[PDB]
Each structure stands twice: as C-alpha cells, then as structure tokens.
C-alpha cells in the first residue's frame, strides 16, 4: 500500500480538484450563483476523477444560458490533454488566465444559469447517476481557446469559451 509522492493518481487528483475550482471561479467571475455547482460538487468530482483515470474524459462542459430564452450566452469547455509523464513535472492552476478571458467573454445576462456535462469516450465505465445528455445548440458560435489552465506533469485541462460569430 505504498503511496507515491509523484504519480498519475496524484496528478489526476490535482487536475480533478482544480478543474472544479476553476469552473467555480468562472461562475463567480461571471457574476453567477455557485450554489447549484456546490450542490453537485461531490458527484462532479466522482465522475471527473473516474473518467480521467481511465483516459475516458474528453471535455468538461459548462453551459451558461439565458433562462428567459434558454439559449447559450457562452459555454466553457475544459479539454483534457493526456500528456502525463513521471508525475514530478510542473503544475499550476491559472486563475488569472480565466479573469483575462472573462473580460473578453462579455457581460452575461441577468440571472443567467449554468449546466455542467461531461464528454466521454464511448467505452467509458458507467458512473451512477449519469446519463446521456444533450448539447444546447452552438450554431453561429465558435470556440476561443486559452491554453493550459490546470496543469500537473503534462495532464492538463485547457479552458476555452464559445462566442457568437
């Protein structure tokens, strides 16, 4: 039952926790209410950690929509980069990266809501409480990528946001 200081599972834990931290910061910096995100933190954690460990998680998706129209105002994708090696490489959680992009994302509508989904590889293990979902349309939108947002020894989440035109 040896526990290694540097390991894939430590890197997975770091990236899991700080992807969720980063999404919470996006919600806060966007002026939204984090309660709904709080209420599902543990279930979001269990699923993200599981599917990272098997290489099955493709993206973490946070839809931010206008409740009056149900349309996306923006969508934040955290694409997973499976470039891990050794486990003793450099790491970071670049909150300042998100604050620079969120200025460019633009003001959100009053009382905008959000929804988290997980993009997975078909052969993924089932995780209790998770079912096939649906995307809100991104027609007329393109994605802006920001670079490595959450990093630990090559395993990374790279944030991006969808915008109009």
């Amino acid at each position: 039952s040896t526990v290694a200081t540097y390991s894939y599972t430590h890197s997975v834990t770091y990236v899991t926790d700080n992807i969720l931290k980063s999404l919470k910061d996006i919600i806060l910096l966007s002026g939204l209410d984090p309660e709904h995100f709080a209420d599902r933190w543990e279930s979001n954690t269990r699923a993200i950690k599981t599917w990272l460990g098997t290489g099955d998680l493709r993206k973490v998706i946070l839809e931010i929509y206008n409740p009056a129209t149900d349309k996306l105002v923006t969508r934040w994708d955290i694409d997973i980069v499976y470039g891990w090696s050794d486990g003793d490489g450099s790491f970071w959680t670049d909150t300042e990266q998100l604050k620079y992009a969120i200025k460019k994302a633009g003001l959100l509508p009053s009382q905008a809501k959000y929804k988290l989904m997980l993009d997975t590889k078909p052969g993924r293990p089932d995780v209790e409480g998770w079912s096939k979902g649906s995307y809100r349309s991104t027609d007329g939108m393109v994605k802006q990528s920001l670079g490595s947002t959450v990093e630990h020894s090559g395993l990374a989440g790279q944030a991006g946001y969808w915008r109009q035109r």
Binding site: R40, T120, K121, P122, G129, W130
Partner: peptide, 7 residues
C-alpha cells in the same frame, strides 16, 4: 464521443 449529464 457521448456527452453525459447528472441525474
């Protein structure tokens, strides 16, 4: 890929 939501 298959997108998943919580239930």
């Amino acid at each position: 890929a298959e997108v998943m939501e919580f239930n």
